[PDB]
Design a protein around this ligand. Structure first.
Ligand SMILES: CC(=O)N[C@@H]1[C@@H](O)[C@H](O[C@@H]2O[C@H](CO[C@H]3O[C@H](CO)[C@@H](O)[C@H](O)[C@@H]3O[C@@H]3O[C@H](CO)[C@@H](O[C@@H]4O[C@H](CO)[C@H](O)[C@H](O)[C@H]4O)[C@H](O)[C@H]3NC(C)=O)[C@@H](O)[C@H](O[C@H]3O[C@H](CO)[C@@H](O)[C@H](O)[C@@H]3O[C@@H]3O[C@H](CO)[C@@H](O[C@@H]4O[C@H](CO[C@]5(C(=O)O)C[C@H](O)[C@@H](NC(C)=O)[C@H]([C@H](O)[C@H](O)CO)O5)[C@H](O)[C@H](O)[C@H]4O)[C@H](O)[C@H]3NC(C)=O)[C@@H]2O)[C@@H](CO)O[C@H]1O
Ligand SMILES: [Ca+2]
Length: 876
């Protein structure tokens, strides 16, 4: 088989029309199968990319000889690339992977992956001298081993995908061949987009049907999911807009439910040619569709292009079998969609009518895109550093630009709304979608607000006028006023500028009064900056971090004294209605700038929906704003925003009376050793989420739990809760907390079975009806604890325990400290050992240890060091 060499072709220029041709519908596929009458080589020149879609076709067939020798030269002459399409499995190996089936020749090694990639290109691209590769990434081609999805093969396809990219495509050694990824996944559900995007020329999305157009429907929230724009926004992170092509599908003969797409016209007996019309169909909609942000798309593609013109059977109507008959295609729908995209105004080339300055036009074209549709949609940064630009005429055609940088434009002498992007001011989206939406939602969407373009002026020596009034510019940043030397008249009114103190804007403002004082022309007409409405923001940090208060029977407002204030984007802090009144009547060059109408109510932020959490040294949590100083206590105050109920915005320390050390929850994360309760829900007692995110209970009448502390230490307090007033009269009414001191009946191997029997000590015996119970404990150093609860109900009583806290100070090896102090206090008890006086050296050193253990300011060093003191004398 003599494969002719590639003929010259023109470069690809958008918009592009692609089409998958099914090999088993070529005449040369199966000579016996005489009902197939179409040919791949008869695709019109409107087809830019012709995808070869091989399955159900013989390997020894004459179609391959026909394609390499006739179809490829024929389509290349009219400018049509012929692309070979392979499934995702071919890049991984395993079930039905083509070349990769020979694992011995191409193993899963770094050298094997490199060699497999070359074999893939040699076999699927270079063998018949095709124009590119197209890897197909969907569930229908996911790598599998023994019919189950292979997470190991998926990883290999990523490595092979890059290795293919180093051979063909935009970053490959051979850039004459395309490398394309068609897919059904959203970019986050696509394992290969993240590393494959730099290596691919184009990217196709298989958005077929009304779900492909309108997206899926979230029946819970009555909202659309995975919409067209959402799908594009996911892939817009990895590829450019001019690489994104959407796709519809024609009617496949004898297609079953789940493969009906209705992307073309539905059949009509009164028009035997309605299928070849394209008006109002999902195919034309996709042709006319453009993303709202970033730039025009690459084009559209069609699957089953051999069935062009065939009308789609009715959804629930009587069956029509003449549509399943195979006829020769004239590809009228394919040509019509090509013309619809070419004649679309969004692809009109940018010419001198838009930007008369040729130095300006070239910069825009080389940065925004050659088409007028990119002006409405470009979403990035435009940098104009070519000094030859004489006229900025036409920058108001830029609608969604994100950053504008004017660098060293000496010949520009005026800047107003007519020579700036229209989103210099707050604007809304004016583009209308052509796709259908969900009739099962409410009325159609409202205009989305377009973010304002960032303006950077620097080096504009010749600039004489700078008019920016009424634009709601948030600050004056990016303006290098020191280089704007020829300015004469400037307007900055009706903005949001905090022109005060030594603010950035106020320093630009004042550097700019200079260049129109050196320039003696200054009137009340030439420099206007009044009617300023700076937006008020929540302060990033708050001032008061600590408060030492005396003990006295008086409540204080915690939020009032700790969390207040409004901060501008330049640094000014306003706390009261008076601070804003002193800020409001602040003059610059004998003239106020803040608007009169803009009052304190409209500027300062509000703390109506803010929440407070006050935790004391015993981990007792309260949510009330007021705080009674009637008890000596050290607290911990946190404030939370409505937008975030987990991360505090300001944290503080309140010390009433003398400062007590804050105790921690020693049982948080406890390991369940044994007991009667369901182990799944026993862990929820010690997990930490304050009384249980709607989880469940322990046993059916009366539960016991035996647990081990993560890090043992000094235990001073304990606390347990009932359910969140979710229940009433079902509360735990009898509780028994126990500590373990029976050393250990050995069996370190089997803790639990002897934990279940040995000698424990009752430390608390609760009996009540409260929702929360807390009680001090007398310095226990145990590491194994037992809790027993009972709600005084039927044998099917279903007792619950959402959370239980063992509260104290983290003291490593506190068990040995308590046992030694017990061994010393009970040994100086017996004054008959020796003289009472010589062992007073131990009697005074034992109350130093005890006072250190009971001090409000728990000092770990003072206890560990003083522990060794009594340890020496018991050693004697
Ligand atoms: C961008 C895009 O669109 N992407 C996808 C796209 O793929 C979707 O299009 C579909 O693609 C189908 C091909 O997918 C394969 O290739 C993909 C890429 O290569 C890949 O991603 C897929 O995963 C899939 O891969 C193949 O997977 C199979 C399964 O594992 C592999 O098969 C195995 O192969 C090994 C050898 O290696 C062994 O032989 C195993 O035994 C075998 O199982 C295969 O290797 C994989 N391929 C590769 C390359 O790895 C495509 O087929 C779909 O098109 C069909 O359906 C439409 C309608 O929906 C129809 O219009 C099409 O013409 C086509 O219909 C088939 O036509 C065949 C050609 O004639 C025909 O095959 C012959 O049938 C004969 C008739 O036989 C009987 C019988 O003997 O029992 C006769 C009975 O009377 C009849 N009963 C009836 C009619 O009631 C039954 C029927 O067949 C019955 O329905 C049983 O189900 O059959 C005879 O048997 C001949 O011997 C035989 O050769 C087929 O029978 C029909 N099939 C049907 C269902 O009609 C489709 O386009 C696209 C769609 O939206 O979008 C994305 O998903
Ligand atoms: Ca809990």
């Amino acid at each position: 088989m003599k494969v002719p060499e590639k003929i010259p072709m023109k470069p690809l220029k958008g918009p592009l029309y692609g089409g998958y041709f099914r090999t088993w519908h070529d005449k040369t596929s199966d000579p016996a199968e005489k009902d197939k009458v179409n040919s791949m080589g008869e695709l019109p020149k409107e087809v830019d990319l012709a995808f070869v879609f091989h399955d159900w076709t013989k390997d020894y067939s004459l179609f391959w000889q026909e394609l390499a020798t006739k179809h490829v030269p024929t389509l290349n002459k009219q400018g049509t690339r012929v692309i070979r399409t392979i499934p995702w499995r071919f890049l991984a190996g395993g079930d039905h992977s083509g070349i990769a089936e020979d694992a011995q020749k191409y193993p899963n090694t770094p050298e094997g992956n490199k060699a497999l990639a070359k074999a893939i290109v040699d076999e699927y691209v270079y063998k018949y001298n095709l124009d590119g590769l197209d890897v197909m990434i969907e569930r229908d081609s996911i790598p599998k081993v023994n019919k189950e999805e292979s997470k190991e093969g998926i990883e290999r396809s990523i490595q092979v995908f890059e290795e293919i990219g180093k051979l063909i495509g935009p970053k490959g050694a051979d850039k004459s061949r395309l490398f394309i990824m068609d897919s059904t996944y959203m970019a986050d559900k696509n394992p290969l987009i993240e590393r494959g995007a730099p290596y691919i020329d184009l990217l196709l999305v298989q958005v077929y049907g009304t779900q492909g157009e309108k997206g899926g429907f979230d029946n819970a929230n009555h909202k659309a999911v995975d919409t067209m724009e959402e799908r594009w926004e996911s892939y817009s992170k990895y590829i450019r807009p001019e690489q994104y092509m959407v796709g519809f599908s024609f009617y496949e003969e004898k297609a079953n439910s789940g493969n009906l797409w209705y992307d073309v016209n539905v059949e009509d007996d009164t028009n035997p040619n309605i299928g070849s019309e394209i008006k109002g169909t999902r195919a034309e909609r996709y042709a006319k569709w453009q993303p709202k942000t970033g730039g025009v798309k690459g084009g559209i593609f069609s699957y089953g292009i051999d069935r062009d013109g065939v009308a789609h059977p009715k959804k629930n109507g009587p069956k029509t079998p003449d549509l399943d008959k195979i006829v020769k295609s004239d590809y009228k729908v394919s040509k019509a969609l090509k013309k619809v995209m070419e004649n679309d105004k969004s692809y009109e080339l940018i010419d001198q009518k838009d930007f008369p300055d040729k130095a300006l036009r070239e910069a825009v074209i080389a940065q925004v895109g050659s088409r007028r549709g990119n002006l409405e949609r470009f979403n990035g940064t435009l940098r104009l550093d070519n000094p030859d630009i004489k006229s900025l005429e036409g920058l108001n055609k830029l609608k969604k630009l994100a950053k504008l940088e004017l660098i060293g434009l000496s010949q520009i002498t005026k800047l107003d709304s007519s020579v700036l992007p229209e989103n210099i001011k707050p604007t809304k989206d004016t583009l209308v979608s052509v796709l259908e939406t969900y009739k099962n939602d409410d009325r159609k969407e409202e205009a989305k607000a377009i973010p304002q373009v960032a303006l950077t002026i620097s080096g504009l020596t010749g600039l004489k006028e700078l008019n920016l009034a009424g634009f709601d510019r948030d600050s004056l940043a990016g303006i290098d006023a020191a280089s704007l030397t020829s300015l004469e008249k400037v307007d900055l009114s009706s903005n949001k500028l905090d022109l005060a103190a030594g603010t950035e804007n106020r320093q630009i403002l004042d550097t700019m009064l200079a260049t129109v004082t050196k320039h003696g022309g200054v009137s009340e007409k030439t420099f206007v900056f009044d009617h300023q409405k700076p937006t008020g923001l929540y302060p990033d940090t708050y001032g008061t971090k600590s408060l030492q208060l005396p003990v006295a029977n008086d409540t204080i407002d915690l939020q009032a004294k700790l969390l207040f204030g409004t901060v501008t984007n330049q640094g000014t802090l306003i706390n009261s209605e008076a601070d804003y009144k002193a800020y409001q009547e602040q003059e610059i060059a004998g003239h106020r700038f803040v608007d009169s109408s803009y009052d304190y109510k409209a500027f300062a932020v509000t703390y109506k929906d803010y929440k407070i959490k006050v935790t004391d040294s015993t981990l007792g949590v309260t949510d009330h704003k007021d705080l009674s100083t009637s008890k000596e206590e050290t607290y911990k105050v946190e404030f939370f925003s409505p937008i975030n109920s987990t991360k505090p915005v300001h944290e503080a320390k309140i010390v009433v009376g003398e400062e007590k050390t804050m105790m921690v929850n020693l049982a948080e994360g406890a390991t369940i050793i044994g007991g009667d309760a369901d182990p799944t829900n026993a862990k929820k007692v010690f997990d930490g989420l304050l009384n249980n995110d709607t989880t469940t209970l322990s046993t059916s009448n009366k539960a016991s739990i035996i647990f081990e502390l993560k890090e043992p230490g000094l235990v001073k307090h304990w606390r347990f809760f009932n359910d969140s007033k979710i229940s009433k009269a079902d509360y735990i009414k009898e509780a028994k907390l126990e500590a373990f001191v029976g050393h250990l009946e050995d069996s370190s191997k089997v803790k639990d079975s002897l934990e279940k029997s040995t000698e424990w000590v009752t430390v608390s015996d609760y009996s009540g009806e409260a929702q929360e119970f807390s009680q001090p404990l007398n310095n226990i150093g145990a590491k194994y604890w037992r809790i027993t609860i009972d709600n005084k109900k039927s044998q099917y009583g279903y007792v619950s325990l959402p959370e239980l806290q063992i509260i104290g100070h983290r003291l490593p090896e506190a068990a040995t400290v308590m046992t030694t102090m017990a061994a010393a206090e009970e040994l100086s008890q017996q004054k008959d050992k020796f003289s009472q006086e010589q062992l007073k050296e131990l009697e005074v050193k034992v109350a130093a240890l005890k006072a250190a253990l009971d001090n409000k300011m728990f000092n770990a060093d003072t206890i560990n060091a003083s522990f060794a003191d009594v340890k020496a004398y018991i050693d004697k």
